[PDB]
Design a protein around this ligand. Sequence first.
Ligand SMILES: CCCCCCCC/C=C\CCCCCCCC(=O)OC[C@H](O)CO
Ligand SMILES: CCCCCCCC/C=C\CCCCCCCC(=O)O
Length: 438
Amino acid sequence: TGAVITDWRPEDPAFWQQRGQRIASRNLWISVPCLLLAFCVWMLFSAVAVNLPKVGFNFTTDQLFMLTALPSVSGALLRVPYSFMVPIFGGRRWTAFSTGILIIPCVWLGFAVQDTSTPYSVFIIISLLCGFAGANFASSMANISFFFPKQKQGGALGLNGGLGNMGVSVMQLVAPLVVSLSIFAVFGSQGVKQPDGTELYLANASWIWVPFLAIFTIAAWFGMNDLATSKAKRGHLWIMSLLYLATFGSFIGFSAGFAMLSKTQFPDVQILQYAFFGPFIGALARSAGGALSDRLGGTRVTLVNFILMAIFSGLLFLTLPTDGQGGSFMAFFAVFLALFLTAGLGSGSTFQMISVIFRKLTMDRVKAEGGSDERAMREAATDTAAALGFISAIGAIGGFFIPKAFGSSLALTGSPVGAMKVFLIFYIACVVITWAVY
Ligand SMILES: CCCCCCCC/C=C\CCCCCCCC(=O)OC[C@H](O)CO
Ligand SMILES: CCCCCCCC/C=C\CCCCCCCC(=O)O
């Protein structure tokens, strides 16, 4: 029952009832909180950048948007490499490592926000380091696919990735709470007197994850396992890439720059009180998207969803001050909730299609070729790990594009309309292209 498992036989019904299920279950429920904490670290600047002017920093609006968009750059670049790391180092060893190193940017960001002389380029580095957390998805999903290789075990991936995405809302909920409280005075936390008369501890938004990162690094080390087992069309790979970019990329893109966008359009509103609700119902709808796609088919769900994305991205224009005249935060917030909801739905819907193409179809193609059940699970798991690594990497681009588009549109034109036009054309194009592959 040691950490390294040399006897792994999922092709044996007896092994699974005796050893297999209990092992795979233990790994999943340590993988989920580790992945959840990664999504907390990944999107940290979505909440931190908003509070940066409140503590003395004078970065431009575009600079603040850039800080929220950059972790999706290093995240996208590292997801394909991360997808190959579990077979090399083992699920347990890599999970402990990929979670443990996330302590460094968290500690650093806490000290950076307490010094107003901290260069913007330092925040750039920290922002890029937070992107390492975003790459944890590809490794975490790859790991689960090996622990749950059987045909009926499809869903352990959706659960791991679904609960992982919850980390965005968790962080956007926890961060505004802890910054009002003084809890790390022992470690050198300094408060900044707000115009409200209250105190603001921006370091807490980052330092709060350090103990939890430490705990589940130890938990992954003593609780997870290393599978000592062998782990050996492109047209579909690009369609899924485009689909996952339009859906998940929208989800993670809106999650990164919503609070910043809301702050530029409605300065009076403390958006961090409600911002977490967006990614929350988005990650929640992700689970509904998979079952909906399985029932109604990937084509019908993707088509209708993209229609709604275009419509809701179109309604977003009506909720904006034009210029300094009118506008409705309530409508602005509600429409974005509709955009978060439809992005998460399509995210889970697209993900369900990925597993159908690269896991189930693969596992059944080898069987039809007379292949064993062991080889069936193996190829399906590795092909899924490799595909999802590529697909999620392309999908992460939206996490950079959307906030950067807003910042560029606001700087060049003094309005977010320019970025929203591009989004609308994109969604309309997605409707057309999805209708092309039909
Ligand atoms: C906090 C600064 C950044 C930290 C970056 C960490 C780098 C990740 C490398 C290994 C992770 C697992 C480390 C092992 C976890 C501790 C295990 C331990 O406490 O003891 C093990 C026992 O002695 C023997 O079985
Ligand atoms: C396989 C691709 C791996 C990508 C690794 C991404 C991690 C990069 C981390 C930071 C490196 C420093 C970036 C340079 C900052 C420039 C600051 C500036 O120009 O203003």
